[PDB]
Every structure is written in structure tokens, then in C-alpha cells.
């Protein structure tokens, strides 16, 4: 059913953090979160703000629109701060469509499975970071 009151069912993270140390996570989560509207914005904001010592975050560098699959863009304040080692943190969000659009060519098993479970009213919404699925969310409507 189409409604303006969804409800997250399950959330998992794929993109590891090995290559993303305190510095990476700080900058990424910093700007990334600063460019979000989640109810945890204030939290992440104050956190990265106290960890870096700067109130500058939420800079948009790259912009990519996708009317039909999702959206994506690169945001990072690290460049404006350090002003020496700029790193555009790419962040895209979409459903099975986008996930597959960049995940692979086509899979009857993946599409069939997605639609198979979607019959329960569940919505597929994952987010990729740096061209790599960082996390995936599954809503239950």
C-alpha cells in the first residue's frame, strides 16, 4: 500500500571499515551525515564536530540524479578543512533497480527473489559509498 509513513524492518552493513579508519570514518560520516536529515543528525554532527574540532561539514562536490532508480552525490568537508588532501565521498541510495544497475547486468534470480519477498509489502532501499554498497535497509510496509 502506498503511504507516507514507512517503517524500517531490518538494517545491515556491507562495506567494511578496514580501509576506512578513524580518519576516513570521521570525514565520511562527518560530511555524509551533515548532508542528511536523519533523526541522528545532531548526534553524528556533534560527534564528528568534537572529534575534528571544526563545525564545517556538509560540502557538496559531485552531483548525480537518477529519476527511476535513486540518487547519488559526493560530499566531503575534509578538503575545505585540511585544504591539501581532498576526498569526494560518493554516496548513492536506491532500490534493487540501482543496486543492480551498478551491481551487475541482469539476474532473473535476483529480480525474482526481490519481487518474491516484495509481495509482503517490503521495500528495498540500500546505500552505496565510494562505489561500494556500504549498507542496506529493508522497510516493511
Swiss-Prot record:
Effect of residue 123 to A: In WD; uncertain significance
Span of the signal peptide: none
Effect noted on mutating residue 37 to G: In WD; common mutation
Tissue spec: Most abundant in liver and kidney and also found in brain. Isoform 2 is expressed in brain but not in liver. The cleaved form WND/140 kDa is found in liver cell lines and other tissues.
Post-translational modification: Isoform 1 may be proteolytically cleaved at the N-terminus to produce the WND/140 kDa form.
Effect of mutating residue 75 to I: In WD; uncertain significance
Effect upon mutating residue 21 to L: In WD; loss of copper transport activity; no effect on ATPase activity
Subcellular location(s) of the protein: Golgi apparatus, trans-Golgi network membrane; Late endosome
Annotated phenotype, changing residue 60 to Y: In WD; uncertain significance
Effect after changing residue 38 to Q: In WD; common mutation; decreased copper transport activity; loss of ATPase activity; cannot form an acylphosphate intermediate during catalysis; does not alter the folding of the nucleotide-binding domain; decreased stability; does not localize to late endosomes
Superkingdom of this protein's organism: Eukaryota
Reported impact of residue 52 to F: In WD; decreased copper transport activity; no effect on ATPase activity; decreased localization to the TGN
Assembly: Monomer. Interacts with COMMD1/MURR1. Interacts with DCTN4, in a copper-dependent manner. Interacts with ATOX1. Interacts (via C-terminus) with ZBTB16/PLZF.
Family indicated by similarity: Belongs to the cation transport ATPase (P-type) (TC 3.A.3) family. Type IB subfamily.
Disease entry from the Swiss-Prot or TrEMBL record: Wilson disease: An autosomal recessive disorder of copper metabolism in which copper cannot be incorporated into ceruloplasmin in liver, and cannot be excreted from the liver into the bile. Copper accumulates in the liver and subsequently in the brain and kidney. The disease is characterized by neurologic manifestations and signs of cirrhosis.
Domain-related comment: Each HMA domain can bind a copper ion, they are tightly packed and closely interact with each other. Wild-type ATP7B can usually be loaded with an average 5.5 copper atoms per molecule.
Reported function: Copper ion transmembrane transporter involved in the export of copper out of the cells. It is involved in copper homeostasis in the liver, where it ensures the efflux of copper from hepatocytes into the bile in response to copper overload.
Protein name in UniProt: Copper-transporting ATPase 2
Upper lineage: Eukaryota, Metazoa, Chordata, Craniata, Vertebrata
Amino acid at each position: 500500500a502506498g503511504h507516507m509513513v514507512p517503517r524500517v524492518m531490518r538494517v545491515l552493513l556491507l562495506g567494511d571499515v578496514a580501509t576506512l579508519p578513524l580518519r576516513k570514518v570521521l570525514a565520511v560520516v562527518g560530511t555524509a551525515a551533515a548532508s542528511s536529515e536523519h533523526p541522528l543528525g545532531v548526534a553524528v554532527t556533534k560527534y564528528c564536530k568534537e572529534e575534528l574540532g571544526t563545525e564545517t561539514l556538509g560540502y557538496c562536490t559531485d552531483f548525480q540524479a537518477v529519476p527511476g532508480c535513486g540518487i547519488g552525490c559526493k560530499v566531503s568537508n575534509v578538503e575545505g578543512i585540511l585544504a591539501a588532501v581532498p576526498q569526494t565521498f560518493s554516496v548513492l541510495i536506491g532500490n534493487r533497480e540501482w543496486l543492480r544497475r551498478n551491481g551487475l547486468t541482469i539476474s532473473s534470480d535476483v529480480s525474482d527473489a526481490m519481487t518474491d519477498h516484495e509481495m509482503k509489502g517490503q521495500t528495498a532501499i540500500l546505500v552505496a559509498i565510494d562505489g561500494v554498497l556500504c549498507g542496506m535497509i529493508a522497510i516493511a510496509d
